[PDB]
């Protein structure tokens, strides 16, 4: 038919975490189709501020990645997580990043 | 560069 | 020493937010240098060394032939719509083109077009013909071949207006190209029951290809080990994974191993 591709989701920090740090948390989105998508960085389930989006781009198989990311400090207790929607999906799933 | 030919279907 | 320059197009019927009508991004070696979408109508820069370009004309230019992308690009969903007897609603429309110089001086080419995410028409460059998915892909093939002409002018871009500009892409961001910065590594654990995982990660390198993996006792683990797949950090650097499940016992034994074009030999590394 018309492709439905559901994405496959990694979260990272730029570098190796240190609780106190300034750093940058990505979330990497891949492998869907359409393109319509909702991307979203919590910290304890709020947004984060100045999140930024890179450049849609495709693979061969057509299907989408975005990065998505944000400066961060990261913490012993804060959990952070990548939120998406895409109607590949039955309802939105959540990504947490391991420390 | 960009390629200045159209593709049309 | 080998390129490509690939130039990534996307059109869809109905826009989202953050998903323009038209999107068109070209990037040089993986990595974004030029982009144009609907919305600013206009082509800018995606990396500093493209302030050399020295055509002048360069960027009316080519906004030009994106606003022609742009309009013929809802053309074809159209003929699309109507070939296929869809109704109207959300349809995609997508497009990859570029070449590449091989480490032997080499030249390729590529042409492929896809609708809703499948393949639907490409360009084989050599024989001057077109691989169609469909039926419906074959009407344009047909279209396409009869007339004798898009084929030929499609495979001169490639083969050289491509590459000549490839060339001077290289050469203006050699600084960019060259460079290269050795990945960030740690490694962590956390013990389950009685089974001790060990996670490798290595942190913006550059470029792109890397070796990671895990040693018992200088022992390549190849069977047990978990190796994620290379992914973007926000500055043109890139990330990788590698994890393997002991025995808590056999911990002193187990060792990750990185190799990269910034190290000059192995870099050897333990929880």
Known sequence: GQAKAAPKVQVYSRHPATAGTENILNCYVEGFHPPKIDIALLKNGEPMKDVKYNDMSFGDDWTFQRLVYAPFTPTKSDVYTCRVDHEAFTEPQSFRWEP | ?9 | EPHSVRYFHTAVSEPSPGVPQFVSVGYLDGEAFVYYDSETRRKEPRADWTSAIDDQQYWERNTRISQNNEQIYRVNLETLRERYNQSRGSHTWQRMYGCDLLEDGSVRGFDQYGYEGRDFIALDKDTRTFTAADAGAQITKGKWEEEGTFAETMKYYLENTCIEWLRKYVSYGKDVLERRERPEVRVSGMEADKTLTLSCRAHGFYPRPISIGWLKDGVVQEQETQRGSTVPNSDGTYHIWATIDVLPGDRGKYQCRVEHASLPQPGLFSW
């Open chain 2, 1 to 9: 560069a960009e390629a200045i030919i159209v593709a049309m279907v």
